Amino acid sequence: WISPELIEILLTILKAVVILLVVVTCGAFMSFGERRLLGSLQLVADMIKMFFKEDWIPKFSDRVIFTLAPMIAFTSLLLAFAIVPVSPGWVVADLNIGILFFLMMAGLAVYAVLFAGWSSNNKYSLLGAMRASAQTLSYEVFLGLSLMGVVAQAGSFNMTDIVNSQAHVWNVIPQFFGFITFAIAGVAVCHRHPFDQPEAEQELADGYHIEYSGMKFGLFFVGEYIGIVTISALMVTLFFGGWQGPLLPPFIWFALKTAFFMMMFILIRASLPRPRYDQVMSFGWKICLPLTLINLLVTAAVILWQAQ
Amino acid sequence: GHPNLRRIMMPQTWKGHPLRKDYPARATEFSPFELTKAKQDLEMEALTFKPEEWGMFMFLNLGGAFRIVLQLDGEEIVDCVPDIGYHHRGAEKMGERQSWHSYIPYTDRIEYLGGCVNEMPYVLAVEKLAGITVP
Amino acid sequence: MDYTLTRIPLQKQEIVTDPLEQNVFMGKLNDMVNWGRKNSIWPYNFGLSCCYVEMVTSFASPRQADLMVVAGTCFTKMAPVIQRLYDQMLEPKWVISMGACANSGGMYDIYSVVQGVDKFIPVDVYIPGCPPRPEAYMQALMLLQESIGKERRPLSWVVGDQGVYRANMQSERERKRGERIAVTNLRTPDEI
Amino acid sequence: MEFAFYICGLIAILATLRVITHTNPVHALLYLIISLLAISGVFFSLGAYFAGALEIIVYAGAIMVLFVFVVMMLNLGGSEIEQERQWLKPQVWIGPAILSAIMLVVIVYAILGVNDQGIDGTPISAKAVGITLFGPYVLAVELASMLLLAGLVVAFHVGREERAGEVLSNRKDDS
Amino acid sequence: TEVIAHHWAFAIFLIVAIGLCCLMLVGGWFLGGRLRLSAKFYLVAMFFVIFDVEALYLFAWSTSIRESGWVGFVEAAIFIFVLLAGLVYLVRIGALDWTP
Numbered sequence: 055w056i057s058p059e060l061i062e063i064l065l066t067i068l069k070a071v072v073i074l075l076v077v078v079t080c081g082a083f084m085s086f087g088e089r090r091l092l093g094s095l096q097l098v099a100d101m102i103k104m105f106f107k108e109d110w111i112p113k114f115s116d117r118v119i120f121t122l123a124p125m126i127a128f129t130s131l132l133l134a135f136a137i138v139p140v141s142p143g144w145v146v147a148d149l150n151i152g153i154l155f156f157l158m159m160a161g162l163a164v165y166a167v168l169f170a171g172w173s174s175n176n177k178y179s180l181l182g183a184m185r186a187s188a189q190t191l192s193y194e195v196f197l198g199l200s201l202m203g204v205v206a207q208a209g210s211f212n213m214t215d216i217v218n219s220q221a222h223v224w225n226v227i228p229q230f231f232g233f234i235t236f237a238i239a240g241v242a243v244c245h246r247h248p249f250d251q252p253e254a255e256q257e258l259a260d261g262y263h264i265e266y267s268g269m270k271f272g273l274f275f276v277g278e279y280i281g282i283v284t285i286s287a288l289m290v291t292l293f294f295g296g297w298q299g300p301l302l303p304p305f306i307w308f309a310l311k312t313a314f315f316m317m318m319f320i321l322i323r324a325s326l327p328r329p330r331y332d333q334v335m336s337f338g339w340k341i342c343l344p345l346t347l348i349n350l351l352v353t354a355a356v357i358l359w360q361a362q
Numbered sequence: 363g364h365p366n367l368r369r370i371m372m373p374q375t376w377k378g379h380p381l382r383k384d385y386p387a388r389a390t391e392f393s394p395f396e397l398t399k400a401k402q403d404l405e406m407e408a409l410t411f412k413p414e415e416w417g418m419f420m421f422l423n424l425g426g427a428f429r430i431v432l433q434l435d436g437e438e439i440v441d442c443v444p445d446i447g448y449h450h451r452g453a454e455k456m457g458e459r460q461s462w463h464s465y466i467p468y469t470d471r472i473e474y475l476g477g478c479v480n481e482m483p484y485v486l487a488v489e490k491l492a493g494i495t496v497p
Numbered sequence: 498m499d500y501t502l503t504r505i506p507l508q509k510q511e512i513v514t515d516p517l518e519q520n521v522f523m524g525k526l527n528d529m530v531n532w533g534r535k536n537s538i539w540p541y542n543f544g545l546s547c548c549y550v551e552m553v554t555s556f557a558s559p560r561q562a563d564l565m566v567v568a569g570t571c572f573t574k575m576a577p578v579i580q581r582l583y584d585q586m587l588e589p590k591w592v593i594s595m596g597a598c599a600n601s602g603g604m605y606d607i608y609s610v611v612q613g614v615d616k617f618i619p620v621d622v623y624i625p626g627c628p629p630r631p632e633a634y635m636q637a638l639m640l641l642q643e644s645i646g647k648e649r650r651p652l653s654w655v656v657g658d659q660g661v662y663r664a665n666m667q668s669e670r671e672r673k674r675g676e677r678i679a680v681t682n683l684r685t686p687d688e689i
Numbered sequence: 690m691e692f693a694f695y696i697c698g699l700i701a702i703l704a705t706l707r708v709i710t711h712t713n714p715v716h717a718l719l720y721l722i723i724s725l726l727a728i729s730g731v732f733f734s735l736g737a738y739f740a741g742a743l744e745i746i747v748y749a750g751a752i753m754v755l756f757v758f759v760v761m762m763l764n765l766g767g768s769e770i771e772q773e774r775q776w777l778k779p780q781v782w783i784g785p786a787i788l789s790a791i792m793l794v795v796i797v798y799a800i801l802g803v804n805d806q807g808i809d810g811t812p813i814s815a816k817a818v819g820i821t822l823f824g825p826y827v828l829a830v831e832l833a834s835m836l837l838l839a840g841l842v843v844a845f846h847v848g849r850e851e852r853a854g855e856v857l858s859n860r861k862d863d864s
Numbered sequence: 865t866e867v868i869a870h871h872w873a874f875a876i877f878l879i880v881a882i883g884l885c886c887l888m889l890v891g892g893w894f895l896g897g898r899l900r901l902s903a904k905f906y907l908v909a910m911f912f913v914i915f916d917v918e919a920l921y922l923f924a925w926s927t928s929i930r931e932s933g934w935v936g937f938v939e940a941a942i943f944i945f946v947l948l949a950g951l952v953y954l955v956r957i958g959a960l961d962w963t964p
């Protein structure tokens with residue numbers, strides 16, 4: 055039954071599984087990388103310890119959505135990475151909706167926080183989940199417009215068309231407003247440090263990570279970091295040059311730019327303090343959304359002006 | 363005529379009075395039955411709370427480390443009687459038990475930030491009792 | 498060395514020998530499990546009276562930490578909180594008793610002080626003395642790390658012996674006896 | 690893409706059937722979420738990529754978010770209604786079910802009798818929806834913006850707090 | 865003969881991701897031995913929903929930006945003007961600030 059079409063199909067399956075394992079181990083390894091920047095076998099030891107620990111189902115909870123919230127937190131923003139092309143011949147998804155799919159995944163990302171907040175039979179955890187969910191909704195509302203700036207510049211949703219429209223000029227310099235709005239929205243949705251733990255203004259609010267022990271907590275622990283690495287991949291493939299470089303191989307260039315952007319995220323971890331909740335919501339509603347709407351109108355006028 | 367006259371430092375299920383001269387100043391035999399009983403009292407103190415013993419809307423117990431009983435009109439605090447006595451080392455009763463010279467570490471262990479400042483008044487009062495004028 | 502086991506303060510423990518002295522796959526797997534539990538340890542620094550600043554200046558949600566540091570004095574009103582927080586944790590669990598107040602009564606032999614943490618929960622590692630230095634805590638972390646590195650715990654609740662095995666380690670005072678007795682001279686206390 | 694369409698339709702029917710006859714509402718909302726996911730897969734299987742992406746973006750990424758937000762907000766578990774168990778009584782269950790099933794059989798009798806050319810390929814992308822969204826159908830999206838503005842105004846005017854506090858116990862008639 | 869391989873790769877990626885998460889969860893499991901929150905949270909969720917549905921019209925505009933001429937730009941401009949008028953109405957009334 056040896057046929058070359060089956061060999062090519064199995065090679066594509068192998069490409070899918072190696073990109074899945076490499077993004078999983080990338081998140082797992084630079085978890086320790088960030089902890090050092092704040093011994094790679096320490097994560098292996100942590101995984102062994104987490105595997106050899108009993109998952110606690112609370113007796114006041116249910117055995118379905120308590121375990122399904124970390125399921126969402128891991129797999130939704132894991133399959134968000136299937137969109138990203140690393141090379142012309144190393145892509146796993148060439149479907150037409152190359153931006154809307156990430157919007158689906160980011161929209162489903164709030165389900166984990168909400169379901170964890172209900173699953174923890176605790177009023178303070180529920181209030182903290184309400185605060186976090188309100189924040190991530192208030193930033194994922196204009197996440198879409200920050201992506202639509204580049205989408206309107208490049209025409210279609212396909213990331214191949216995006217990175218082929220990045221041939222003459224990368225989209226970071228004509229659209230810096232879209233870049234900063236997408237960076238802010240990706241920080242807030244993935245719960246990165248400045249837009250993180252909104253329980254700081256009320257002692258009647260607690261985290262949704264509480265009452266999660268063992269594997270159900272490790273799913274969040276690796277899911278947020280897989281989310282930030284796929285958000286970095288989205289960022290480079292949209293605003294920077296996806297696989298574009300003069301001399302070094304394209305996947306080396308993609309890895310270098312992704313590493314550069316999460317060292318920039320380490321710089322974000324180091325530099326700015328955490329703003330207050332009212333300031334965060336007021337910023338995300340009053341400044342970001344009109345600015346990205348004006349950015350879309352401006353890039354519309356620009357792309358319709360020099361259309362010859 | 364004193365409102366909410368109750369035990370403040372010792373738990374409410376206490377038999378005698380500690381600083382009275384006939385009270386033995388030693389730890390008794392630690393029976394685990396008392397520990398399990400007090401754990402069971404801590405189990406249903408939040409759901410079966412009685413707002414008449416404390417001298418007190420929703421009632422909760424918000425967890426140095428100490429707990430304070432909070433009454434809330436929504437999120438607004440109406441009444442608050444804190445629960446103290448959770449760090450009662452018994453400094454005075456041991457002051458009746460140690461000598462003048464051996465109480466100095468117990469004088470250190472009143473507050474932890476002070477230390478030497480904490481042993482100043484005891485030393486000066488002991489010097490007053492003896493009649494010592496330090497150079 | 499000999500081993501003690503607990504199988505299902507009033508529990509029974511008697512002396513046995515490890516099952517690895519007899520499956521070479523299980524011996525390597527148990528060693529890897531002990532190594533993974535060794536190098537990855539999450540503490541639960543319990544909030545109590547005045548060994549806090551020694552655990553504050555040494556360098557944390559509950560029920561994910563497999564190690565509990567009982568530091569301050571154990572009172573009659575705080576001991577049920579200690580017991581509840583101990584049963585909140587999930588096995589495997591280890592206890593480090595910081596200071597004299599947790600090893601024993603700790604200068605307080607009085608009515609309102611429980612004479613050590615051993616009266617209600619077991620303690621794995623003890624640190625003696627009023628407030629211990631954070632280096633003593635870190636050395637105790639080494640001690641419990643090697644103690645965890647030599648155990649025999651069940652891998653799963655389906656096949657195998659359903660009893661954890663503690664190691665009867667050599668005490669640190671006999672191991673350090675030569676280095677401690679063989680001290681000839683010390684610095685006089687009239688200088689710095 | 691036909692067996693995927695059939696299995697997505699079957700699990701959508703099953704998921705909404707568990708939605709209709711459930712007891713606690715958060716599980717019913719989860720079943721409606723996977724039902725909307727299955728209908729999105731149906732939309733993808735018929736070449737309407739924009740429709741399925743929209744269902745998970747909007748209908749499952751915003752609307753079910755509002756439903757679970759309300760449920761998780763005001764703390765219903767269905768209290769005082771689960772113990773009654775009115776919907777799992779038969780004298781209320783036969784009537785509307787057989788009436789709406791008579792509606793089902795008459796409307797699927799009306800379904801038949803139409804020529805079958807089949808669902809073709811040629812998946813309509815978002816580009817065609819864009820070029821027919823701002824061509825012949827301009828006033829549709831303009832007055833749909835006006836309609837969404839009206840809905841926002843209506844629901845904000847109806848459902849605001851009028852009281853101060855991020856934690857509120859329930860008073861009758863709002864004090 | 866390439867898009868079928870891509871769909872197969874998508875399928876095995878999804879299936880083995882959920883399978884990896886399932887095996888990870890069950891390997892963790894196997895081994896070892898009357899109140900109300902608020903109304904402003906609902907209000908901000910409703911703001912998100914309405915502005916996301918208007919963002920949907922912007923989503924569909926962004927793909928056909930070039931094929932529609934300046935008249936489509938004018939129509940999307942007055943659409944965005946209505947959107948920003950609603951947003952600035954929300955800003956100015958005071959229903960958008962938190963003040964905890």
Ligand code: SF4
Nearest residue numbers: 547548596597598627
């Ligand atoms: S050992 Fe000393 S410093 Fe530590 S809790 Fe006891 S009295 Fe305080």
